[PDB]
From Swiss-Prot, chain A:
GO (cellular component) term, any one: nucleoplasm
ZnF segments: C4-type: 134-160
Parent-protein residues present: 201 to 864 of 868
Main location (coarse class): nucleus
Keyword Nucleotide-binding part of the UniProt annotation: yes
Quaternary structure note: Component of the MCM2-7 complex. The complex forms a toroidal hexameric ring with the proposed subunit order MCM2-MCM6-MCM4-MCM7-MCM3-MCM5; loaded onto DNA, forms a head-head double hexamer.
Disulfide bonds: none
A GO molecular function held by the record: ATP binding
Misc. comment: Present with 1690 molecules/cell in log phase SD medium. Early fractionation of eukaryotic MCM proteins yielded a variety of dimeric, trimeric and tetrameric complexes with unclear biological significance. Specifically a MCM467 subcomplex is shown to have in vitro helicase activity which is inhibited by the MCM2 subunit. The MCM2-7 hexamer is the proposed physiological active complex.
Protein origin, superkingdom: Eukaryota
Phenotype when changing C157 to Y/F/S/H: Loss of activity
Protein name: DNA replication licensing factor MCM2
Annotated phenotype, changing E185K: In allele MCM2-1
The organism of origin for this protein: Saccharomyces cerevisiae (strain ATCC 204508 / S288c) (Baker's yeast)
Known catalytic reactions: ATP + H2O = ADP + phosphate + H(+)
Curated annotation (Swiss-Prot), chain B:
Additional notes on this entry: Present with 10300 molecules/cell in log phase SD medium.
Job of this protein: Acts as a component of the MCM2-7 complex (MCM complex) which is the putative replicative helicase essential for 'once per cell cycle' DNA replication initiation and elongation in eukaryotic cells. The active ATPase sites in the MCM2-7 ring are formed through the interaction surfaces of two neighboring subunits such that a critical structure of a conserved arginine finger motif is provided in trans relative to the ATP-binding site of the Walker A box of the adjacent subunit.
Lineage: Eukaryota, Fungi, Dikarya, Ascomycota, Saccharomycotina
Shown chain mapped onto the complete sequence: 260 to 693 of 775
Listed name of the protein: Minichromosome maintenance protein 5
Paired cysteines (S-S): none
Curated annotation (Swiss-Prot), chain C:
Record-level GO BP terms: cell division; double-strand break repair via break-induced replication; pre-replicative complex assembly involved in nuclear cell cycle DNA replication; regulation of DNA-templated DNA replication initiation
Subunit architecture: Associates with the MCM2-7 complex. Interacts with MCM2, ORC1, ORC2 and ORC6.
GO molecular function: DNA replication origin binding
Range of the intact protein held here: 13 to 415 of 604
Keyword set, alphabetical order: Cell cycle, Cell division, Cytoplasm, DNA-binding, Mitosis, Nucleus
Record localization: Cytoplasm; Nucleus
Similarity comment text for this entry: Belongs to the Cdt1 family.
Name recorded for this polypeptide: Cell division cycle protein CDT1
Broad class of the protein's primary localization: cytoplasm
Signal peptide: none
A GO cellular component entry from the record: nucleoplasm
Native organism: Saccharomyces cerevisiae (strain ATCC 204508 / S288c) (Baker's yeast)
The keyword Ribosomal protein appears for this protein: no
Highest taxon listed in the record's lineage: Eukaryota
Function: DNA replication licensing factor, required for pre-replication complex assembly. Faithful duplication of the genetic material requires 'once per cell cycle' DNA replication initiation and elongation. Central to this control is the tightly regulated formation of prereplicative complexes (preRCs) at future origins of DNA replication. Required for the recruitment of the MCM2-7 helicase complex to the replication origins.
Amino acid sequence: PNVSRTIARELKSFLLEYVYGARIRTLGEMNSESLEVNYRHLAESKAILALFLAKCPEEMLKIFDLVAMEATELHYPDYARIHSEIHVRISDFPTIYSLRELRESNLSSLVRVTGVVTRRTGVFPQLKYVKFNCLKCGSILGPFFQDSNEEIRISFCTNCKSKGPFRVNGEKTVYRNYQRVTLQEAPGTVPPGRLPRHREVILLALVDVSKPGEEVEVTGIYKIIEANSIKRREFSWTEEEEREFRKISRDRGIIDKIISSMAPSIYGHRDIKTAVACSLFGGVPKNVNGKHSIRGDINVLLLGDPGTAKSQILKYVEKTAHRAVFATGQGASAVGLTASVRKDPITKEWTLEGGAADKGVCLIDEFDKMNDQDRTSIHEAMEQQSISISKAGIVTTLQARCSIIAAANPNGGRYNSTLPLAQNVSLTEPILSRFDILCVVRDLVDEEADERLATFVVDSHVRSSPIPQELLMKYIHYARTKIYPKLHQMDMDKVSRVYADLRRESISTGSFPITVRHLESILRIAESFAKMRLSEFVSSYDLDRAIKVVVDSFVDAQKVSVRRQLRRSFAIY
Amino acid sequence: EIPELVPVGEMPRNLTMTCDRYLTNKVIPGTRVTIVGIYSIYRTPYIKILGIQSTEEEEEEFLQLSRNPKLYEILTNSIAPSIFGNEDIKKAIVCLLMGGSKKILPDGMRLRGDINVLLLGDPGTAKSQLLKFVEKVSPIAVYTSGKGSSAAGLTASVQRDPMTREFYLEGGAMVLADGGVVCIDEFDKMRDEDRVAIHEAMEQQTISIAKAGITTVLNSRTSVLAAANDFQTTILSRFDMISIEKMKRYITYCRLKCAPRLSPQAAEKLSSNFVTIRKQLLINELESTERPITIRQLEAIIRITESLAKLELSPIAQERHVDEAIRLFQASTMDAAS
Amino acid sequence: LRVPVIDLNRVSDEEQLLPVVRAILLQHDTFLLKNYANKAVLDALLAGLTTKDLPDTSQGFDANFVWLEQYIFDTDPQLRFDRKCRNESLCSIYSRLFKLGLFFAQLCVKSVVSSAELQDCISTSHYATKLTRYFNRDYVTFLPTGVLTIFPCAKAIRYKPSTMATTDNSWVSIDEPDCLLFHTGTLLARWSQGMHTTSPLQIDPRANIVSLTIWPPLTTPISSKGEGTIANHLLEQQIKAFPKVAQQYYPRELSILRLQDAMKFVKELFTVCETVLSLNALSRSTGVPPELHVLLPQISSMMKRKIVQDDILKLLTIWSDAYVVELNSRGELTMNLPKRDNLTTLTNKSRTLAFVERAESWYQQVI
């Protein structure tokens, strides 16, 4: 149509009257081909262009590249010798859709969707055109083939009129660059009972800038989604809820209220939920001059009798938290640590995908019942916050810095308290050393516990002071994405004095030692409590709760013969 | 291109070339090869080979530097610019390049000249920074790691030619290091199919391979300079120790020119040292400590003395090199005892 | 990242750099100055720490709460201005940076229509500097209140979403070691024919933002657009309007007579809201019934500030003839378009101008 000719000259006058000169000089000097245009800018200028981009973006994209190349040609001479075409990046889409709202009415239009990328393919062959060799007469014939069907069977020759066997000739054929990533819905925003959907995305002209296993925002057209723009930056906090969170965090020591708000179904005890809350709230990751990456996550390990609740609590924690997936699994396990390089049968190739939480928390149930692959993958992810892929022609180190909450059972049911935890569990010491907190429950008897536990669990079943659940789960996302509390060298050296007592007393009476990882763990627990307290820095008494958390985990993980250590730690209790 | 001089942000690139008829099979893969041809285009570039091959002031300044009596000492004050301490590790690293005295006996049972050196400790302390200097200093050496690396492997890799899925081989740092040393990092991360090959090549230099149509014994004059953090016997038994262009030219001229020997006057001190260490560690060994002392360590001491007497470009050895050799060996025995 | 780097050992005679400096501010308006003689006086910023004894009353330190003492340093010989703190080391760095500021003024305000009026700090000594000492969420976007401001800093750069330099509408930040950053004010952007910009600031590692401005006179004759409003009163209204004021009568009177002009954060909602409803009109042949839960994060992702029903209630209060407030059977607010076509850009431009005129009439009648 000639109506595009009055569209072209409109936006040609728009780019010289708005930041577009700085945008075109940055794409021209970086020899770049990506031009950035915000939707609000031209939408404030002309809403009819925004309506045309929302209705027919495929014919709207035939004007954009031409006027961008014309602006680059009169701004820079001979730019067509190196770069023939320059694309545009339509960002700032207001109506962000979900993957379950993708319907028949959203066809041939612009859509911004959130997701997680997996099984990414780079520069993998795509077909646009074909040819075919007819074997009977030995002739050539060719049509078209895009990116959705398998292939358009050709069975009728020109003059053979035969049903002979035909062969695929792609030795005169088109050149297609294909990078399709199977995007999935995030588990932190899926409704309960339903399953997350998945789609296939085409990436062209934007390959290997995306990270698998992370949240992503893609703006493209819907037909199979053909992505135009990618964004690796991304139930949220608002302005009306952020002032009341600081007002709630300033009054009445909210750490214990968050602990009491963690388990509404049962009474429990604070040793499981204190480790659970400090593991979900996490610490901060720090590096010195680009190296020495410390793990900011806290991996907790639960142990005890089978009757006691370990799965219900984990499930509740997962529901409460963002990007937390309860993978669990024993026999099912399959590919360990969600990271895998594998062949794919749809088009016969090699691909890499990190399964399903790079910032999230992964929940493992029945830790003692696994094979060699899923133990080694979680040992690599616990040793380092990354999983490397070094096969099928690809080498990629993906983020596996996810917190680990594992639950296990001992060999025989009973805890057998007259033996240490190393003889009790089947696991050894270096896989136990990655877990900083080892919480363990035991058995109990008198009327007191019978009067409280059964009444609280029957109160939880007869019904269909603490902090409410919605404000708590909004506070988790508000504190984990805005603050980073450091430490100041004013009086922190005193903990190096008390560690100097606490290390030495573990040799003379105990058998298992205390190392520098426990010091890193109590600094992470103290900064996690400072994160939950929403302070600027860690206080002096946060380390008191941190040393209490490490004493009732390490001393409780041993025999009854470390009983003198129950009173030896009473001076700092 | 040469991996000792390649920027750290990106892997080294490559080039494809076409070789004709008269120079076929004249180049073993893995050496310093100078190629002259035509840079043609098939867009993609390729090289048509038309020729193949592989300053007296340099030897004058090397002869002037060889006359310095504190030369060993400045060499050690030059291999460690920021490394604090560890002189015994530095001398053992700089003395494990050539190996020892290669002697071709008339009975056919020749002796091995190369040795083995192993780094061990906490992360840092240039365990992988001194390896870059030994990768860029030595004549033939290639940097690799434990269980191969990203799209490259120390072990003889095998995979599919993508044309119609063919089985073929990928030479690692083991066949390409013919006549030099090999240098790896992360010794604890080793696959079982590569450990048997390095287990045989660290003591026999030969690597044997046998599969579908290819059966071969590859010569691997490859000394090992590993770094680490049933494994106890392979660490404690298979390891003996637990300008720059002018230096490389002098190292190549010394490795090709001379073939030293040993005098009995300096060998009697070695015999007395062996008798005293066997008479002194037997108290610790009959006391059921179960940790050693062998003749292989004595042969390694002999190779260390041959390397120390070879560095001044001399075919004879004296007590001056054996007094530094027993001091180099005592730190390894103190590390092995505790 | 592309900041111009010059040397200071050859510009001491002032004969080789003026043309280049004039040329370089056409695209880049954040200058970096290195290698001066302040290598032993710059680390002496530990003297003026704990005074805390006088009230604000638009002079000296506005001591707001152990965390901030903003010294709005008034000038000495002008009327209604008298301020003298101790500040010996700060007097030495003020003398060196004031000579540096007059040096940059003589080398860069000579390429405009007036090269003797804008440097009138040489005669009357008109200086009201911002010594914001953040000693032991943050403050609003601060542009320099003078016409030229050179300051020692750690990073000193950010970018609010607008049509200015580094136009990508995101907060950009670079780090710079041992140097000074120059930024010019908004009066020089109106004096020079459109060649400047603005820059937001926050808590830097070198938290003492010693902003030493040129600060033009009480009676400087600005041109036709600003002949009635002087530089002193307008910039003093901006100076007393950005932080909190609770000390005396007049800036609190200026705050209650000037902070009700915040329609630009809600009328800009009217520059984008119809766009999205029209985007819902060209895609949903459902007769466009909207839901509040799906229209709220759309405009909350289109605009970084908080958007809740107070803005919808304010838009209903200012313009009720173009929208409905009709509730459905379920119990939520619904709102549609009264146009029979989808959208016409000329009618949309006329409706936006009428909304702007209605809000301007509301601003005139509210005061």
